Amino acid sequence: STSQVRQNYHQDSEAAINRQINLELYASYVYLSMSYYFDRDDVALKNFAKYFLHQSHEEREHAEKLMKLQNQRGGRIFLQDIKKPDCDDWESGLNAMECALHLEKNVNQSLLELHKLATDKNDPHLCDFIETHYLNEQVKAIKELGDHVTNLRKMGAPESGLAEYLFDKHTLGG
Amino acid sequence: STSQVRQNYHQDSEAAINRQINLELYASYVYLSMSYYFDRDDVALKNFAKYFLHQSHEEREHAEKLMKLQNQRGGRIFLQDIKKPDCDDWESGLNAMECALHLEKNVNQSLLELHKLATDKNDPHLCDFIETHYLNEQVKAIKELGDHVTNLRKMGAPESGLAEYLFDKHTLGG
Amino acid sequence: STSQVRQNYHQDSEAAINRQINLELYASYVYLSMSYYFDRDDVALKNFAKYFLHQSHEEREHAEKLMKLQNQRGGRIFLQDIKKPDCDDWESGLNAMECALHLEKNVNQSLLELHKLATDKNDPHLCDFIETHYLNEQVKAIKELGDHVTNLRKMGAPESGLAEYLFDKHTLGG
Amino acid sequence: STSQVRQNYHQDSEAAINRQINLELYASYVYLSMSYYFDRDDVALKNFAKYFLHQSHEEREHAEKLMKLQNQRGGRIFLQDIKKPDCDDWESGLNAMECALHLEKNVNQSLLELHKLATDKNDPHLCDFIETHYLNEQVKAIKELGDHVTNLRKMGAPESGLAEYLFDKHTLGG
Amino acid sequence: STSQVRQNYHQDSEAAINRQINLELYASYVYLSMSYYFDRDDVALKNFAKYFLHQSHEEREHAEKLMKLQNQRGGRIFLQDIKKPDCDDWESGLNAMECALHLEKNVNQSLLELHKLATDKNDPHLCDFIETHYLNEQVKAIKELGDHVTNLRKMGAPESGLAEYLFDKHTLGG
Amino acid sequence: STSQVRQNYHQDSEAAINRQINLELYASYVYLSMSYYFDRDDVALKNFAKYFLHQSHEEREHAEKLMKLQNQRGGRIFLQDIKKPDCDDWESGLNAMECALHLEKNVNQSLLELHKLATDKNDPHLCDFIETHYLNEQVKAIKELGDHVTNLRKMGAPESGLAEYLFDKHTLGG
Ligand SMILES: [Au+]
Ligand SMILES: [Au+]
Ligand SMILES: [Au+]
Ligand SMILES: [Au+]
Ligand SMILES: [Au+]
Ligand SMILES: [Au+]
Ligand SMILES: [Au+]
Ligand SMILES: [Au+]
Ligand SMILES: [Au+]
Ligand SMILES: [Au+]
Ligand SMILES: [Au+]
Ligand SMILES: [Au+]
Ligand SMILES: [Au+]
Ligand SMILES: [Au+]
Ligand SMILES: [Au+]
Ligand SMILES: [Au+]
Ligand SMILES: [Au+]
Ligand SMILES: [Au+]
Ligand SMILES: [Au+]
Ligand SMILES: [Au+]
Ligand SMILES: [Au+]
Ligand SMILES: [Au+]
Ligand SMILES: [Au+]
Ligand SMILES: [Au+]
Ligand SMILES: [Au+]
Ligand SMILES: [Au+]
Ligand SMILES: [Au+]
Ligand SMILES: [Au+]
Ligand SMILES: [Au+]
Ligand SMILES: [Au+]
Ligand SMILES: [Cl-]
Ligand SMILES: [Cl-]
Ligand SMILES: [Cl-]
Ligand SMILES: [Cl-]
Ligand SMILES: [Cl-]
Ligand SMILES: [Cl-]
Ligand SMILES: [Cl-]
Ligand SMILES: [Cl-]
Ligand SMILES: [Cl-]
Ligand SMILES: [Cl-]
Ligand SMILES: [Cl-]
Ligand SMILES: [Cl-]
Ligand SMILES: [Cl-]
Ligand SMILES: [Cl-]
Ligand SMILES: [Cl-]
Ligand SMILES: [Cl-]
Ligand SMILES: [Cl-]
Ligand SMILES: [Cl-]
Ligand SMILES: [Cl-]
Ligand SMILES: [Cl-]
Ligand SMILES: [Cl-]
Ligand SMILES: [Cl-]
Ligand SMILES: [Cl-]
Ligand SMILES: [Cl-]
Ligand SMILES: [Cl-]
Ligand SMILES: [Cl-]
Ligand SMILES: [Cl-]
Ligand SMILES: [Cl-]
Ligand SMILES: [Cl-]
Ligand SMILES: [Cl-]
Ligand SMILES: [Cl-]
Ligand SMILES: [Cl-]
Ligand SMILES: [Fe+3]
Ligand SMILES: [Fe+3]
Ligand SMILES: [Fe+3]
Ligand SMILES: [Fe+3]
Ligand SMILES: [Fe+3]
Ligand SMILES: [Fe+3]
Ligand SMILES: [Mg+2]
Ligand SMILES: [Mg+2]
Ligand SMILES: [Mg+2]
Ligand SMILES: [Mg+2]
Ligand SMILES: [Mg+2]
Ligand SMILES: [Mg+2]
Ligand SMILES: [Mg+2]
Ligand SMILES: [Mg+2]
Ligand SMILES: [Mg+2]
Ligand SMILES: [Mg+2]
Ligand SMILES: [Mg+2]
Ligand SMILES: [Mg+2]
Ligand SMILES: [Mg+2]
Ligand SMILES: [Mg+2]
Ligand SMILES: [Mg+2]
Ligand SMILES: [Mg+2]
Ligand SMILES: [Mg+2]
Ligand SMILES: [Mg+2]
Ligand SMILES: [Mg+2]
Ligand SMILES: [Mg+2]
Ligand SMILES: [Mg+2]
Ligand SMILES: [Mg+2]
Ligand SMILES: [Mg+2]
Ligand SMILES: [Mg+2]
Ligand SMILES: [Mg+2]
Ligand SMILES: [Mg+2]
Ligand SMILES: [Mg+2]
Ligand SMILES: [Mg+2]
Ligand SMILES: [Mg+2]
Ligand SMILES: [Mg+2]
Ligand SMILES: [Mg+2]
Ligand SMILES: [Mg+2]
Ligand SMILES: [Mg+2]
Ligand SMILES: [Mg+2]
Ligand SMILES: [Mg+2]
Ligand SMILES: [Mg+2]
Ligand SMILES: [Mg+2]
Ligand SMILES: [Mg+2]
Ligand SMILES: [Mg+2]
Ligand SMILES: [Mg+2]
Ligand SMILES: [Mg+2]
Ligand SMILES: [Mg+2]
Ligand SMILES: [Mg+2]
Ligand SMILES: [Mg+2]
């Protein structure tokens, strides 16, 4: 039976929102894994660890907002397994930042495909939701990660452990 | 090569900590799923939703503390997929509370098996970690969920939607 | 029928908790009796009276925490008569302090037997409960009472009513 | 030998005060038992539990004031065993309230018999003590418990677990 | 003659506590020596000096708590010479941090042997004392020192005097 | 090779400063031992214990200032074992105060010999250091301990446990 609230909400959009919820939860899990890598005693970069833990908690918030959207529009949430991150060892601060850049660009591509679907189904509320809450967040995240990668490369990372140490203090510390 | 920090930390304990990290992340995901079920427009119990979202965020903290422990002791974190919850539809406030009770007792049983292992490997630091940060938390969680189940049953849930409405306001609201 | 909360809680542990509840209530009653002895007009040591009344109220709190534990774990409270203290006349400040020392060491021995049982039944939550809330409390109580007995003996109690008077002011007063 | 303070204090009054001390301690123990019944996971009415625990602590204060009176008048305190409550399972909020009503009327009858004795022995200080500190307290307690019993009966207790739940929140909660 | 407070306290446990007191005083002396090495005009790392002086004062507190425990349990303190540190010249910030790591792991091993003894003598109060006040302190200390060693190695210490200078400012300074 | 800072600092003065550092650490250890003697349950004079613990921590500060002096002048610290106190049992408050008096006069004699050496080597900076930071401290310490010994003797210590009790409260308490 049709939800009493549902209006102009295509079944393909509903399914795509469920896919996006899984992707945001996956991103949360990737950042959680990265964070505790930097907490290892043989890595020991505490501001890298705090930066990625914050990004993990952000992504959980991104997922919860999409779950709230699904219910606002009268769709039904269907959850899937959250796959483990492809990587147990992230190697260095520079490599983790490059992996985060690549993650945040795949999430953006998924959101752009979701916006194209919403446009094709003439769902301006969903278009505005994506634009307002997700697309500029992603552009800002990608720009920040690019900036971080550039600085770590210019400073001599990953071979310079002094580069990663000083970036941890001065950019992330900090 | 052996971590420079590692002392009295058995390889079986290290593996069991990695298993427990996955279980805590799984519990976080179960509570996330339960929370947004109560946010559906055709369920609409906002204090059930907030209660379970808080429990989800707690469990993420439980996982992060175990990741920090692994690194404190010189073990190595190895992550696995976070399985989706077995349930997409949690049916009622009473049923979700019963499922949470059953989840929090399985997590407790895993922690008791972890404590038995730590005891068998003569690891008093790990025993104290489990006792201090996990075992009484679990006893309190189980007692609270039992209390909630009892009240919902006595009030007439799940058949009485008025019971679940009033429990949402007065116990969870609240 | 089994409590919906009960997990890893042996029936022998449940019975031993009920025994301990009675012992804590008994200790509360002993200290109540001691307190009002020092309120008699022919004893008249008001800080001895306040010290023992505080210890009485503490013990009631110890009993209530064990009652809460019984319910947290899904056991059932069964109460017994609270026996009157073996003594109506406590004779002196020194003698009451010696009787309190002997009481607080019997309570400790009961708690150590309860911990041995919890250990034998592989109940780490109950072990941690006893260690966290009871065993160091008892060690501190026993040490304080020993200290008090020593000072009263060194000052010349019980034969010196001036010793007990001055201890009442300066140590208990006070 | 006669206390240096004793004046106009009959030996029968002294004995009756000792009886009343035991009764007040018994009442304290009854309310303690009732309180933790409502803390069970299969009863779970936390404001019933707090209400009865407060009444328990009140009664201990009633006992201590009578112990102080005994010494003020030059009598000698003699303590007896505190009998366990006649009931381990109090069945419901309504039944516990009825049992408390019956307890508070038996305590009142004992205090009225104590006042008749004080009157017959021409002890106006003891009459005034009873009137000032005990008799209106009892009338207020009995009226409050009657009010509570009436409301629980009108709301449909004990068969309505919703009645007891809502009384717990709104009258005792509360 | 037996202390009036002593209960369930084995003579082997008493002796082991005296050994541990000496070890904690020794650790205090090692850190004192390390601190003033970094105060030399030809070493001149003032935050290394302050870090180790703080660790020295901590260890004195660890010793004093064990002396208080000995008396709480009715044992008798017997002191031994505090041996001088094996090292007059600690060579570098990295080497001192490695020596501190090795010291804090030997202290941990002594505390684990003390806990095994307490367990074998069925002394749950002493087990809880060790777990509560010592074992997690040690795990945290060892993890922090491991982290410090890792960062100094990654930054290029000891050959890079710039590495030790910058670690002194940014991690210890500071 | 000669320290770049060293000027007018004789090698005999450098060695004598190292001897004095050991003596101050020894004094710290003596007072630590005395403090915990008064913490025993069969001694139980808590203000004697706090007085001596404070004196212990003072002496550690005296040692650290001499270590800083050694480095200020370009000398090299060389540490020796800290001998255990000659006494495990200090017998009484009066005896401990007499032992402290004798300790503080031996430390003074060592400082006067150090000043004679500095004078003979025409080292006015070292003379002024000793005069400014040590010699009047010692005169004050010796005068205070003499005062304490006198009062304890006049009050009837050590045979009067009441004397030591009251001195603990009124002079040290206090
Ligand atoms: Au990778
Ligand atoms: Au990978
Ligand atoms: Au990657
Ligand atoms: Au990557
Ligand atoms: Au659109
Ligand atoms: Au289910
Ligand atoms: Au299911
Ligand atoms: Au379930
Ligand atoms: Au379920
Ligand atoms: Au263990
Ligand atoms: Au007795
Ligand atoms: Au007796
Ligand atoms: Au006794
Ligand atoms: Au006794
Ligand atoms: Au256990
Ligand atoms: Au009954
Ligand atoms: Au009954
Ligand atoms: Au009844
Ligand atoms: Au009744
Ligand atoms: Au009267
Ligand atoms: Au060395
Ligand atoms: Au060496
Ligand atoms: Au070393
Ligand atoms: Au070393
Ligand atoms: Au133990
Ligand atoms: Au001596
Ligand atoms: Au001696
Ligand atoms: Au001496
Ligand atoms: Au001496
Ligand atoms: Au001079
Ligand atoms: Cl639609
Ligand atoms: Cl559709
Ligand atoms: Cl799946
Ligand atoms: Cl990857
Ligand atoms: Cl922007
Ligand atoms: Cl190991
Ligand atoms: Cl191993
Ligand atoms: Cl996997
Ligand atoms: Cl399920
Ligand atoms: Cl608790
Ligand atoms: Cl069970
Ligand atoms: Cl069983
Ligand atoms: Cl009985
Ligand atoms: Cl007795
Ligand atoms: Cl303590
Ligand atoms: Cl009379
Ligand atoms: Cl009479
Ligand atoms: Cl009796
Ligand atoms: Cl009854
Ligand atoms: Cl009134
Ligand atoms: Cl209502
Ligand atoms: Cl013993
Ligand atoms: Cl023994
Ligand atoms: Cl020695
Ligand atoms: Cl060394
Ligand atoms: Cl921690
Ligand atoms: Cl020179
Ligand atoms: Cl020279
Ligand atoms: Cl030496
Ligand atoms: Cl000596
Ligand atoms: Cl002066
Ligand atoms: Cl005085
Ligand atoms: Fe996201
Ligand atoms: Fe958890
Ligand atoms: Fe107790
Ligand atoms: Fe009463
Ligand atoms: Fe230590
Ligand atoms: Fe000194
Ligand atoms: Mg509908
Ligand atoms: Mg997806
Ligand atoms: Mg860390
Ligand atoms: Mg982000
Ligand atoms: Mg699957
Ligand atoms: Mg648009
Ligand atoms: Mg837009
Ligand atoms: Mg925007
Ligand atoms: Mg290594
Ligand atoms: Mg697992
Ligand atoms: Mg909502
Ligand atoms: Mg929880
Ligand atoms: Mg896979
Ligand atoms: Mg244990
Ligand atoms: Mg524990
Ligand atoms: Mg705890
Ligand atoms: Mg049941
Ligand atoms: Mg018993
Ligand atoms: Mg009085
Ligand atoms: Mg006590
Ligand atoms: Mg009976
Ligand atoms: Mg414990
Ligand atoms: Mg404790
Ligand atoms: Mg008389
Ligand atoms: Mg009676
Ligand atoms: Mg409760
Ligand atoms: Mg009442
Ligand atoms: Mg009897
Ligand atoms: Mg009146
Ligand atoms: Mg009145
Ligand atoms: Mg003795
Ligand atoms: Mg040793
Ligand atoms: Mg300096
Ligand atoms: Mg330390
Ligand atoms: Mg020797
Ligand atoms: Mg512990
Ligand atoms: Mg701890
Ligand atoms: Mg040079
Ligand atoms: Mg010397
Ligand atoms: Mg003490
Ligand atoms: Mg001094
Ligand atoms: Mg040697
Ligand atoms: Mg001068
Ligand atoms: Mg001066």
Q: HEC string of chain A?
A: CCCCCCCCCCHHHHHHHHHHHHHHHHHHHHHHHHHHHHCCCCCCCHHHHHHHHHHHHHHHHHHHHHHHHHHHHCCCCCCCCECCCCCCCCCCHHHHHHHHHHHHHHHHHHHHHHHHHHHHCCCHHHHHHHHHHHHHHHHHHHHHHHHHHHHHHHHCCCCCHHHHHHHHHHCCCC
Question: Which H or E run contains B92?
Answer: none
**Nearest to residue C98, comparing CAs of E5, F107, B98?**
E5
**Nearest to residue C31, comparing CAs of C47, C51, C15?**
C51
Range B14-19, long-range pairs (CB < 8 A, 24+ positions): B14/B70, B14/B73, B14/B75, B14/B76, B16/B113, B16/B114, B16/B117, B17/B66, B17/B69, B17/B70, B17/B75, B17/B114, B18/B70, B18/B75, B18/B77, B18/B78, B18/B79, B18/B80, B19/B110
3-state SS class at B82: strand
3-state SS class at E161: helix
Residue indicated by tokens 């038995």? B116
| Cα D96-D97-D98 angle, rounded to 5 deg | 90
Residue indicated by tokens 């303070």? D5
Answer for the pair A96, A147: CB distance below 8 angstroms, yes or no. Answer: no
User: What are the two backbone dihedrals, phi and then psi, of residue A156, each rounded to the nearest 5 degrees?
Assistant: 105, 15
| Cα D45-D50-D52 angle, rounded to 5 deg | 100
Q: Does F85 touch chain E (CB under 8 A)?
A: yes
Q: What is the DSSP letter of B85?
A: P
- Please state, in angstroms and rounded to a whole number, the distance separating the CA atoms of residues E145 and E148: 5
Q: What is the DSSP letter of D92?
A: S
Q: What is the DSSP letter of E8?
A: S
Distance of CA B8 to the CA centre of its chain: 28
- Please state, in angstroms and rounded to a whole number, the distance separating the CA atoms of residues F158 and E74: 22
Q: Which residues contact D129 (CB under 8 A, 6 or more apart)?
A: D69
| Cα A6-A9-A12 angle, rounded to 5 deg | 130
**Nearest to residue A40, comparing CAs of B73, F110, E33, D71?**
B73
DSSP H helices, chain D, are 11-38, 46-73, 93-120, 124-130, 136-155, 161-170
Show the tokens assigned to E147: 């982290």
**Nearest to residue A11, comparing CAs of A110, A130, A124, A121?**
A121
**Interchain pair B125, E135: CB under 8 A:** yes
Q: How far is E112 from chain B (nearest CA, A)?
A: 7
**Nearest to residue C37, comparing CAs of C73, C90, C106?**
C90
Q: How far is B1 from chain C (nearest CA, A)?
A: 34
For residue F82, list its beta bridge partners.
E82
Three-state DSSP string of F86-142: CCCCCCCHHHHHHHHHHHHHHHHHHHHHHHHHHHHCCCHHHHHHHHHHHHHHHHHHH
Q: What is the DSSP letter of E135?
A: I
Q: Does F164 touch chain C (CB under 8 A)?
A: yes
Resolution in A: 1.2
Q: Does D159 touch chain B (CB under 8 A)?
A: no
3-state SS class at B63: helix
Answer for the pair D117, D17: CB distance below 8 angstroms, yes or no. Answer: no
3-state SS class at D20: helix
Scored b (16 or more CB within 10 A) or e, E85-116 reads: beeeebebbbbbbbbbbebbbebbebbbebbe
* F near A: at least 3 beta-carbon pairs less than 8 Å apart: no
Range D168-174, long-range pairs (CB < 8 A, 24+ positions): D168/D45, D168/D46, D168/D47, D168/D48, D168/D93, D169/B170, D169/D47, D172/D47, D172/D48, D172/D50, D172/D51, D173/D47, D174/D47
Alpha-carbon torsion C142, C147, C152, C154, what sign?
Answer: positive
**For residue F102, how many other CB atoms are within 10 A of its CB?**
11
Q: Does F67 touch chain E (CB under 8 A)?
A: yes
Show the tokens assigned to E42: 């030809």
Q: Does F166 touch chain C (CB under 8 A)?
A: yes
| Cα E38-E41-E45 angle, rounded to 5 deg | 35
Q: Does B156 touch chain D (CB under 8 A)?
A: yes
For residue A82, list its beta bridge partners.
B82
Answer for the pair E70, E21: CB distance below 8 angstroms, yes or no. Answer: yes
Q: Which amino acid is at D126?
A: L
Three-state DSSP string of chain C: CCCCCCCCCCHHHHHHHHHHHHHHHHHHHHHHHHHHHHCCCCCCCHHHHHHHHHHHHHHHHHHHHHHHHHHHHCCCCCCCCECCCCCCCCCCHHHHHHHHHHHHHHHHHHHHHHHHHHHHCCCHHHHHHHHHHHHHHHHHHHHHHHHHHHHHHHHCCCCCHHHHHHHHHHCCCC
Answer whether the bond into residue A124 is a cis peptide, omega within 30°. Answer: no
- Please state, in angstroms and rounded to a whole number, the distance separating the CA atoms of residues C32 and D22: 12
What end-to-end distance do the CA atoms of chain C give, in Å? Answer: 53
- Please state, in angstroms and rounded to a whole number, the distance separating the CA atoms of residues E118 and B127: 15
Q: Which amino acid is at B146?
A: G
- Cβ burial of E165 (10 Å; 0-12, 13-18, 19+) is middle
**Interchain pair E140, B72: CB under 8 A:** yes
Answer for the pair C163, C156: CB distance below 8 angstroms, yes or no. Answer: yes
| Cα B87-B93-B98 angle, rounded to 5 deg | 65
Q: Does E19 touch chain F (CB under 8 A)?
A: no
| Cα B23-B25-B27 angle, rounded to 5 deg | 70
User: What are the two backbone dihedrals, phi and then psi, of residue D124, each rounded to the nearest 5 degrees?
Assistant: -70, -30
- Please state, in angstroms and rounded to a whole number, the distance separating the CA atoms of residues C125 and C112: 15
Q: Which amino acid is at B7?
A: Q
- Please state, in angstroms and rounded to a whole number, the distance separating the CA atoms of residues C3 and C1: 7
Q: Which residues contact B151 (CB under 8 A, 6 or more apart)?
A: B167, B171, D44, D161, D165
| Cα E44-E50-E53 angle, rounded to 5 deg | 115
**Interchain pair C136, E128: CB under 8 A:** yes
Answer for the pair E31, E59: CB distance below 8 angstroms, yes or no. Answer: yes
Is E59 annotated as a binding-site member? yes
**Interchain pair E156, A162: CB under 8 A:** yes
Answer whether the bond into residue E174 is a cis peptide, omega within 30°. Answer: yes
Show the tokens assigned to D156: 């449909």
What end-to-end distance do the CA atoms of chain E give, in Å? Answer: 53
**Nearest to residue B67, comparing CAs of B18, B34, B113?**
B18
**Nearest to residue C124, comparing CAs of A31, F27, B109, F162?**
B109
3-state SS class at B61: helix
Is A164 annotated as a binding-site member? no
Answer for the pair D14, D74: CB distance below 8 angstroms, yes or no. Answer: no
> What one-character-per-residue DSSP string does F34-97 give?
HHHHHTSTTT--HHHHHHHHHHHHHHHHHHHHHHHHHHHHT-------BPPPS-S---SHHHHH
Answer whether the bond into residue F173 is a cis peptide, omega within 30°. Answer: no
Q: Which amino acid is at C9?
A: Y
Answer for the pair E63, E80: CB distance below 8 angstroms, yes or no. Answer: no
Q: Does D43 touch chain B (CB under 8 A)?
A: yes
Show the tokens assigned to E69: 């425990």
Contacts E132 to B, Cβ<8 Å: 128
**Nearest to residue A29, comparing CAs of A88, A111, A115, A71?**
A88
**For residue C91, how many other CB atoms are within 10 A of its CB?**
13
- Please state, in angstroms and rounded to a whole number, the distance separating the CA atoms of residues D61 and D56: 9
> What one-character-per-residue DSSP string does D116-131 give?
HHHHHTT-HHHHHHHI
Distance of CA B120 to the CA centre of its chain: 25
Alpha-carbon torsion F155, F156, F159, F162, what sign?
Answer: negative
Contacts D167 to B, Cβ<8 Å: none
- Please state, in angstroms and rounded to a whole number, the distance separating the CA atoms of residues E170 and C144: 46
Q: What is the DSSP letter of D90?
A: -
Neighbours of chain D (3+ CB pairs under 8 A): B, C
**Interchain pair C37, D77: CB under 8 A:** yes
3-state SS class at E82: strand
> What CA–CA distances, in Å, run from C24 to C144, D23, D29?
19, 20, 12
Q: Which residues contact D116 (CB under 8 A, 6 or more apart)?
A: none
Neighbours of chain F (3+ CB pairs under 8 A): C, E
Neighbours of chain C (3+ CB pairs under 8 A): B, D, E, F
**Interchain pair F83, E81: CB under 8 A:** yes
- Please state, in angstroms and rounded to a whole number, the distance separating the CA atoms of residues E13 and E123: 9
Q: How far is B74 from chain E (nearest CA, A)?
A: 8
Q: Which amino acid is at E121?
A: K
Count chain B–chain E contacts defined by CB atoms under 8 A. 51
Contacts B154 to D, Cβ<8 Å: 161-162, 164-165
Show the tokens assigned to B41: 């427009």
Q: What is the DSSP letter of D40?
A: S
- Please state, in angstroms and rounded to a whole number, the distance separating the CA atoms of residues F69 and C126: 55
Contacts E3 to C, Cβ<8 Å: 146
Answer for the pair C73, C6: CB distance below 8 angstroms, yes or no. Answer: yes
**Interchain pair C81, D83: CB under 8 A:** yes
> What CA–CA distances, in Å, run from F143 to A91, F146, F147?
66, 5, 6
Which technique was used to obtain these atomic coordinates? X-ray
- Please state, in angstroms and rounded to a whole number, the distance separating the CA atoms of residues C152 and B135: 43
Query: Ligand 27 mean position to E62 CA, how many Å?
Result: 25
3-state SS class at D82: strand
Range F110-113, long-range pairs (CB < 8 A, 24+ positions): F110/F19, F110/F20, F110/F23, F111/F20, F111/F135, F111/F138, F113/F16
Q: Does F99 touch chain E (CB under 8 A)?
A: no
**Nearest to residue D119, comparing CAs of D104, D129, D106?**
D129
Q: How far is B41 from chain C (nearest CA, A)?
A: 31
Angle between helices D93-120 and D136-155 (to 10 degrees): 160
| Cα F88-F94-F95 angle, rounded to 5 deg | 35
Show the tokens assigned to D115: 């006042």
| Cα E144-E148-E152 angle, rounded to 5 deg | 170
- Please state, in angstroms and rounded to a whole number, the distance separating the CA atoms of residues C152 and C93: 8
Answer for the pair E28, E56: CB distance below 8 angstroms, yes or no. Answer: yes
Answer for the pair C23, C110: CB distance below 8 angstroms, yes or no. Answer: yes
**Nearest to residue B17, comparing CAs of B82, B60, B78, B84?**
B78
